[PDB]
Design a protein around this ligand. Sequence first.
Ligand SMILES: [Zn+2]
Length: 129
Amino acid sequence: ADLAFEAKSARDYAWYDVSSFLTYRVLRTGELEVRVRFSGHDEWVNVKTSVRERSIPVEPSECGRVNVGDLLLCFQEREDQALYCDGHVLNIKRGIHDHARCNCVFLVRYELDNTEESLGLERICRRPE
Ligand SMILES: [Zn+2]
């Protein structure tokens, strides 16, 4: 099936699903940027760093494929806002569950500010592969 992407916002440094792409531009420094139209407004993002293939949700029967050190798109809830930003799995507490719901617990370190949090499979999306 078709490719779908997400783009990193230069405002909050989170990732959003790209609905479509509009145009591109080169910087005199040489970087390639792309104008991205989001889902749900309009940004320029570094192709090389800030554009990638959309993260994939993980099904309870899959949780074995997520490991310590992995990079993950994590749902990050705070006061008002909530963002989907990059983090790395530091430690995993495996639970007992079936195919219905994953109660394994993932300690991840957010890339931006280096903070830590315990997330359930329901709040993480893996990178392809
Ligand atoms: Zn699990």
